[PDB]
Amino acid sequence: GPHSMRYFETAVSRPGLEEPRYISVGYVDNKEFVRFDSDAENPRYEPRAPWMEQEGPEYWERETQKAKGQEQWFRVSLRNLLGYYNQSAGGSHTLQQMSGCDLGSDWRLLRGYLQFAYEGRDYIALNEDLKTWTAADMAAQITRRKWEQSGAAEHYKAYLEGECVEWLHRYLKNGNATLLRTDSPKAHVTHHPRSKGEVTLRCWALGFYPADITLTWQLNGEELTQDMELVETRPAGDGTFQKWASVVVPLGKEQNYTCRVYHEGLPEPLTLRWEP
């Protein structure tokens, strides 16, 4: 199917110390594969997945240099932004950048991303045409004009269309049996007696990958949306995910209600109920 590479970068100011903390995490298909943390004793991009382990020292030094330069770039931009927003001295401030590429199921570039948040709020984003910028506010307009002048979008487009795609291809092959594989949800229902004449059908999806999933509860045939409790899809820690969906039900009416699980790994949607 389709695939994606994302680098998520964060620089955070804090009252007190000369230089802010810079972190970069790389994901192939929303599975962590590299990390850089300026706090670590020996700051460097490190492998966060076994298949990435077979890149050589030159790979690691070149990517590290990019992180070190990014650190400098975020440091300067943090200060530039202080002035743009007429923020005084100190405060805690944050700058986020997301970037990368989506491929289709044919492995060709579907969409490129290059975008920034200041203080958790959209600042500037490279448009989908990969040539023009959307600027969230007047401050961002300054940046936009600046980057229009320097032709920075051309730089970004070249990375997005070229390097990003070309190396995502290399990673998809190298870690073949992890990224291009799916793990389907193991599904089951636990039962929890409640107040008067009310039990609680919780329906579990465990151990799936990727993270996108959907759970519904049905009675007689009409999907139940209200009355129902959902939890946010959560990492199990081992590369997989969990979710559950629960509902209110009277005693006796267990074999009426049915949970459905919708996941890419399934040959088809999944149906189930309480099993005494």
Binding site: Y7, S24, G26, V34, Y45, E63, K66, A67, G69, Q70, W73, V76, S77, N80, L81, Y84, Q97, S99, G100, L114, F116, T143, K146, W147, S150, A152, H155, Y156, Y159, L160, E163, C164, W167
Partner: peptide, 9 residues
């Protein structure tokens, strides 16, 4: 492989 920025904010 990671992007890198050029012109600052």
């Amino acid at each position: 492989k990671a992007v890198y920025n050029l012109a600052t904010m």
